Amino acid sequence: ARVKRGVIARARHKKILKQAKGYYGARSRVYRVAFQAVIKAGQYAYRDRRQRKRQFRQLWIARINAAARQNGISYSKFINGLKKASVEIDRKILADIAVFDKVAFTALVEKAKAALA
Amino acid sequence: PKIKTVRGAAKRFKKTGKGGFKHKHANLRHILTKKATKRKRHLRPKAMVSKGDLGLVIACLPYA
Amino acid sequence: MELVLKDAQSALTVSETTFGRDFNEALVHQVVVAYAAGARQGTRAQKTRAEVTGSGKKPWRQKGTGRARSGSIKSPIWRSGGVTFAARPQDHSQKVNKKMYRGALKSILSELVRQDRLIVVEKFSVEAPKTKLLAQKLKDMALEDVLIITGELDENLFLAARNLHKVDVRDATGIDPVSLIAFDKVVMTADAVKQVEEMLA
Amino acid sequence: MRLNTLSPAEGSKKAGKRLGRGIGSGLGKTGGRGHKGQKSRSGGGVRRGFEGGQMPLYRRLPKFGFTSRKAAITAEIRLSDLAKVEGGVVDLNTLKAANIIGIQIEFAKVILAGEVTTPVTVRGLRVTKGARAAIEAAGGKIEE
RNA sequence: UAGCGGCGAGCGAACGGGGAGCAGCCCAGAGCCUGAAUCAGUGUGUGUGUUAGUGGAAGCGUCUGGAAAGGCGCGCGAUACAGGGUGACAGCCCCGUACACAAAAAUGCACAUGCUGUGAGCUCGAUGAGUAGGGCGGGACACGUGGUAUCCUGUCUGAAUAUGGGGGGACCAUCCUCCAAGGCUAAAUACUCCUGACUGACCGAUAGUGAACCAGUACCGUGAGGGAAAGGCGAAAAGAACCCCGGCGAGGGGAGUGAAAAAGAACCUGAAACCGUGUACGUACAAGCAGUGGGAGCACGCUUAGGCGUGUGACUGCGUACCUUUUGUAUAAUGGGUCAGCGACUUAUAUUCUGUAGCAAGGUUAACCGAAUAGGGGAGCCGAAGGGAAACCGAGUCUUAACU
RNA sequence: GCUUGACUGCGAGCGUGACGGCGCGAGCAGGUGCGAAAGCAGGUCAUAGUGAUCCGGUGGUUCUGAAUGGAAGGGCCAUC
Ligand SMILES: [Mg+2]
Ligand SMILES: [Mg+2]
Ligand SMILES: [Mg+2]
Ligand SMILES: [Mg+2]
Ligand SMILES: [Mg+2]
Ligand SMILES: [Mg+2]
Ligand SMILES: [Mg+2]
Ligand SMILES: [Mg+2]
Ligand SMILES: [Mg+2]
Ligand SMILES: [Mg+2]
Ligand SMILES: [Mg+2]
Ligand SMILES: [Mg+2]
Ligand SMILES: [Mg+2]
Ligand SMILES: [Mg+2]
Ligand SMILES: [Mg+2]
Ligand SMILES: [Mg+2]
Ligand SMILES: [Mg+2]
Ligand SMILES: [Mg+2]
Ligand SMILES: [Mg+2]
Ligand SMILES: [Mg+2]
Ligand SMILES: [Mg+2]
Ligand SMILES: [Mg+2]
Ligand SMILES: [Mg+2]
Ligand SMILES: [Mg+2]
Ligand SMILES: [Mg+2]
Ligand SMILES: [Mg+2]
Ligand SMILES: [Mg+2]
Ligand SMILES: [Mg+2]
Ligand SMILES: [Mg+2]
Ligand SMILES: [Mg+2]
Ligand SMILES: [Mg+2]
Ligand SMILES: [Mg+2]
Ligand SMILES: [Mg+2]
Ligand SMILES: [Mg+2]
Ligand SMILES: [Mg+2]
Ligand SMILES: [Mg+2]
Ligand SMILES: [Mg+2]
């Protein structure tokens, strides 16, 4: 029962090579190089599924601080005021409001200033 | 082909009823006079192979 | 335990244990697999590094060339070299215990009775040695793929069926477990039922 | 019941290990052999009884005993066997006919193993006490 | 297993049983009986086969298609549906196959019979000498000189001779058993340079023979010797008339052939590395495993608007390859220029454990026979009893004078 | 002072060792010594003072004894 390996080997190589589209040089052409670039991309992505959550929160907070600072209060005091005011609007939604609804944000700031007074 | 029994081991061990192995004790061949009577007496009966060594003996005695 | 002859009002009593036992698939599977292993002509070989024709000369020296160290032009790593675990002829046959084979035969026959694949007749006679006469008989009995099991080899019947690919005519002693499973229907003469019952019991 | 509806019993056909066929299998690379020793090497492994050069047990311990040639021509017989002979009599020679004892056994002994439920005559054989009583308790006639 | 064994590594019987197949004869001498057994050749007759060969069944219509054997439909033969071919897959087109037949000539193996040679049958005799055995040295016997029988003999010796000798594992005695020193002998057994037929859970052009091909060639080597690579147009050559560019070129474009030339001989299919042309997007103030997450803009499609799809990817967070070997490697430690192909835990026998199946205090047969994967064969192996160095005893045994 | 317990067969149970093994041990049987007796004694206050197996040697032991009776050799016990 002799088994030629060409058809299954070609597929195994093509799958990786398809995953390596857009990569520079040997990284999109050569299997030995391509397989290492695909695995690395996977590792980075997996890392980036977690990293993204940290980055987006980092962005929201800087956006909230700016608006809050614009409206008169630091981020630190602002989130404490919303806590003591029982407000459970998350950082994703505060930062959307800071950009798109500046008067609604002002209201959330006065509520925080109130619960701190 | 057939496993070859280690002939030297076939001359030192014998299989007991529950699969164990009896063997004659060491230190009773010669230099007997400086050894206490009591030490010689306990060496006269056949002891059983300990757990650590039954693998070696069974390996050597396949047709036992 | 009883078998209705398709062509008679009369029935034939037989043993429940041979025609009425349960279907043990595992035992049957082991016996059908052994039969196929027993049918293998295990005739092949390859050449190990020793059997490849060529010299034992080192192709190049061990050290000083930047080449990979080599020792044999017949190394299995090398194109034209030997097969690492080159095949030899081997017998693929298996031991079937006497009782396991009879046990599977009894199981198979019981399962043909349960599945109505066993037909029983007083006799299965073709008069002259012609397919045309037998093919009519099997078309009148509503049979296409069928193993005919007679007690006695009828010369006319073996010949008349030889050119029919889906028909095989055997003696009671010629049964095998595969042919009982392989054909759609099994037709057994009354006297063949007697022989098989005595064989197996 | 056709040639494509026949399975083996579950648990009857284990896969079979394949070494050095990749990471996922769990037997890839070194294929279960670990790293860098005699045992790793192809055809690597010390012989049976080698204990690293320490005087091994089979030679550390003394030889004992001799083999009696008599024991090989001496067979024990169970009471269960006394019914397996044809004719009620139990001689050394009719025990050979019943494949109880070897064809080269010259001495035979009936021991108290199993039960005899028959009148049996035992001739030219030896009989244990316990065995002598089981024979006598069933119509037995032991004859020296 | 018994044994042999620096009692190490390892070597490894026989007795006896089951089977295959069996076949017994002659000389060492005389006489009566005489060619009466027996193969050997060497003729002939009759059968048998080989070496060439003969016949050998039965199908049309329609659909697709370059082409039908394919589809559909309705038929026919089959002791032939083994196979191989034919413009795609044919029981019925072909070659064949089953079955039936066949030899002028030569020849094989069997028989019958004839010429020539060899002698049985009877009767009474005869019973293999530098031999057996021994010493010395060696070898062979499973057996390493060991307590070592037995066989062989290089050397030195050297009997008895049927009232006698050899052996029965030191040796002696007794008992049994055979009769050396002279020979022949079929079958069961071994093998396959070669031939024929058939088969294959064998390979299918880096495989399989080294060699599918003009291969033991080319080539290397003083020589012995070493030793490649290299298969495929098409159904059919129908292998591209003729015209045009070009050097009466190479090569190409048309034309024509063909189902296909996107099958044109550098020819089935025609992957990958590698190299190019074209289009989209980005890129000339920008620093690093070149990705990843975010993400504008642009291009191109979508959606009846809809923050979605594809390609590109400015800018930005994170981010020093893989393997190996290591306490530890971005490591300036090892290996890899790349692609493709090949390239490594097998096989056989033993043994044990597990699972699973069968039978079960019984289980199972091996060789072999063959009613051939059946059935037969139970010779054997394991298990149901062990203890003891052993005799021996025995559900107990050993130990000890005997055991709390 | 008297003596040979520097006894023989065994040994509940512990300890210490990967193993080989080493060690401690009441008590039992037999026989002994000391002591009026209870009792003590299976070597020395203890912990070092040693060498596996093989191959042999010696003595004992009718265990085995390659047809059988023996023997050789082997085994077993003690010791080298
Ligand atoms: Mg000794
Ligand atoms: Mg090859
Ligand atoms: Mg069989
Ligand atoms: Mg792991
Ligand atoms: Mg390694
Ligand atoms: Mg290491
Ligand atoms: Mg290791
Ligand atoms: Mg038997
Ligand atoms: Mg032999
Ligand atoms: Mg013809
Ligand atoms: Mg024809
Ligand atoms: Mg000599
Ligand atoms: Mg002689
Ligand atoms: Mg006689
Ligand atoms: Mg003579
Ligand atoms: Mg080749
Ligand atoms: Mg190819
Ligand atoms: Mg070659
Ligand atoms: Mg080649
Ligand atoms: Mg031209
Ligand atoms: Mg092509
Ligand atoms: Mg091309
Ligand atoms: Mg710029
Ligand atoms: Mg740069
Ligand atoms: Mg960085
Ligand atoms: Mg290092
Ligand atoms: Mg280092
Ligand atoms: Mg690091
Ligand atoms: Mg560098
Ligand atoms: Mg270096
Ligand atoms: Mg490196
Ligand atoms: Mg390198
Ligand atoms: Mg006492
Ligand atoms: Mg001291
Ligand atoms: Mg002695
Ligand atoms: Mg003798
Ligand atoms: Mg004797």
D2 at C interface, C-beta within 8 A: yes
Q: How far is CA D129 from CA C181, D91, D109, D112, D140, in A?
A: 59, 18, 11, 8, 13
User: Distance between CA atoms of C99 and D97, rounded to whole angstroms?
Assistant: 25
Chain C touches chain B, with at least 3 Cβ pairs below 8 Å, answer no
User: Distance between CA atoms of D98 and C24, rounded to whole angstroms?
Assistant: 35
- Crossing angle of helices C98-114 and C190-200, rounded to 10°: 140
Q: Is beta strand B47-48 parallel, antiparallel or unpaired with respect to D121-123?
A: unpaired
Q: Are C152 and C190 in contact (CB under 8 A)?
A: no
Question: Tokens standing for D86?
Answer: 């044809």
Closest to C10 (Cα-Cα) out of C152, C123, C153, C117: C123
Q: C146 - beta bridge partners?
A: C167, C185
Question: Tokens standing for C74?
Answer: 């017949």
DSSP C31-98: HHHHHHHHT---------TTTSSS--S-SS-SSSSSSPP---TT-TTSTT---TT---------PPPH
Work out how many domains chain A is built from and give that number. Answer: 1
Angle, CA D35 vertex, CA D29 and CA D40 arms, to 5°? 85
Please give, chain by chain, protein residues whose CB is below 7 Å from any atom of strand F.
Answer: B 24-45, 47, 49-50, 52-53; D 51, 54-55, 57, 59-66, 68-70
* Protein CA A6 to sugar C1' E263 (Å): 26
In one-letter notation, the amino acid at residue D135 is I
User: Distance between CA atoms of D94 and D108, rounded to whole angstroms?
Assistant: 12
The kind and range of the H/E element at C139 are helix C131-140
User: Distance between CA atoms of C29 and C101, rounded to whole angstroms?
Assistant: 11
Angle, CA A39 vertex, CA A36 and CA A40 arms, to 5°? 85
* Protein CA A63 to sugar C1' E307 (Å): 21
- C168 phi/psi in degrees, rounded to 5: -135, 130
User: Distance between CA atoms of C142 and C144, rounded to whole angstroms?
Assistant: 7
The position carrying tokens 């090989």 is D72
- B15 phi/psi in degrees, rounded to 5: -75, 130
Q: Which of B8, B24, B49 sits opposite D64 (nearest CB)?
A: B24
D42 at C interface, C-beta within 8 A: no
Q: Are C161 and C169 in contact (CB under 8 A)?
A: yes
- A36 phi/psi in degrees, rounded to 5: -75, -25
Q: Is beta strand C2-4 parallel, antiparallel or unpaired with respect to C11-13?
A: antiparallel
Q: Are D138 and D119 in contact (CB under 8 A)?
A: yes
Q: How far is CA C12 from CA B22, C148, C149, C193, D125, in A?
A: 65, 18, 16, 9, 54
In one-letter notation, the amino acid at residue C138 is L
Q: Is D53 annotated as a binding residue?
A: no
Q: Tell me which CATH code domain C2-200 carries.
A: 3.40.1370.10
User: Distance between CA atoms of A64 and A57, rounded to whole angstroms?
Assistant: 10
Angle, CA C59 vertex, CA C54 and CA C60 arms, to 5°? 170
DSSP chain B: -PPPP-HHHHTTEEE-TTS-EEEPPSS-SS--SSS-HHHHHHHSSPEEPPGGGHHHHHHH-TT-
The resolution, in Å, is: 2.2
Angle, CA C191 vertex, CA C189 and CA C195 arms, to 5°? 110
Closest to A71 (Cα-Cα) out of A32, A44, A97, A37: A97
In one-letter notation, the amino acid at residue A8 is I
Suggest the residue from B6, B29, B31 to mutate for an interface test with chain D (most D CBs closer than 10 A). B6
User: Distance between CA atoms of C151 and C120, rounded to whole angstroms?
Assistant: 12
Q: Are B60 and B6 in contact (CB under 8 A)?
A: yes
**A88 CA → ligand 20 middle, Å:** 87
- Other C-beta atoms lying within 10 Å of the C-beta of residue D83: 15
DSSP 3-state of C11: strand
Question: Tokens standing for C151?
Answer: 């007690």
Q: Is the CB of A16 under 7 A from strand E?
A: no
Suggest the residue from C181, C183, C184 to mutate for an interface test with chain D (most D CBs closer than 10 A). C181
User: Distance between CA atoms of D109 and D142, rounded to whole angstroms?
Assistant: 12
Residues of C in contact with D1 (CB under 8 A): 23, 28, 108, 111-112, 115, 181
DSSP tally for chain A: helices H, then strands E: 6, 0
The position carrying tokens 């034939």 is C12
Nucleotide with C1' nearest the A14 CA: E272
**C60 CA → ligand 19 middle, Å:** 19
C123 at D interface, C-beta within 8 A: no
Cβ–Cβ gap D6/C28 under 8 Å: yes
The kind and range of the H/E element at D89 are strand D89-90
For chain D, state the CA radius of gyration. 29
Q: Are C126 and C134 in contact (CB under 8 A)?
A: yes
DSSP D52: B
Closest to B3 (Cα-Cα) out of B45, B48, B55, B62: B62
Q: Are C78 and C52 in contact (CB under 8 A)?
A: no
DSSP 3-state of D19: coil
User: Distance between CA atoms of C129 and C161, rounded to whole angstroms?
Assistant: 9
Report the phi/psi class of residue C142: left, alpha or beta, with left for phi > 0 and alpha for psi in -120 to 50. Answer: left
- Experimental technique for the deposited model: cryo-EM
User: Distance between CA atoms of A76 and A88, rounded to whole angstroms?
Assistant: 15
The position carrying tokens 């049996």 is D120
Q: A87 - beta bridge partners?
A: none
Residues of D in contact with B29 (CB under 8 A): 62
User: Distance between CA atoms of B55 and B62, rounded to whole angstroms?
Assistant: 11
Q: Any idea how long chain A is?
A: 117
Q: Sort C61 into a burial class: Cβ within 10 Å, 0-12 / 13-18 / 19+.
A: exposed
The residues, any chain, with a CB within 8 Å of residue B50's CB and separated by 6 or more, are: none
Q: Is beta strand D89-90 parallel, antiparallel or unpaired with respect to D121-123?
A: parallel
The residues, any chain, with a CB within 8 Å of residue A40's CB and separated by 6 or more, are: none
The residues, any chain, with a CB within 8 Å of residue D112's CB and separated by 6 or more, are: D79, D128, D130, D131, D134
